[PDB]
Amino acid sequence: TESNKKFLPFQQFGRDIADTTDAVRDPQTLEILDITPCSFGGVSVITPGT
């Protein structure tokens, strides 16, 4: 996604509390982008006796 975070001229990466990459900068366009995961949690089954 696209974010509006300010960056320094010599900064490269942004790191979250979990110490994992979240925000990057495009090496050839010089614009800032943000990374988020895509999946989610699990399911459950309701059933009477077999």
* Cβ nearer to other proteins, comparing 18 with 30: 18
> Per rule CB under 8 A, is residue 3 in the interface with other proteins?
yes
Contact present, 3 and 36 (Cβ < 8 Å) = no
Residue 50 CA, chain-centre distance (Å), reads 43
> Per rule CB under 8 A, is residue 18 in the interface with other proteins?
yes
**Contact with other proteins (CB under 8 A) among 9, 41, 48, 49:** 41
Strand partners, 42: none
φ/ψ region of 29 (left if φ > 0, alpha if ψ in -120 to 50, else beta) reads alpha
> Per rule CB under 8 A, is residue 44 in the interface with other proteins?
no
Contact residues toward other proteins (CB under 8 A) are 1, 3-4, 16-18, 34, 36-37, 40-41
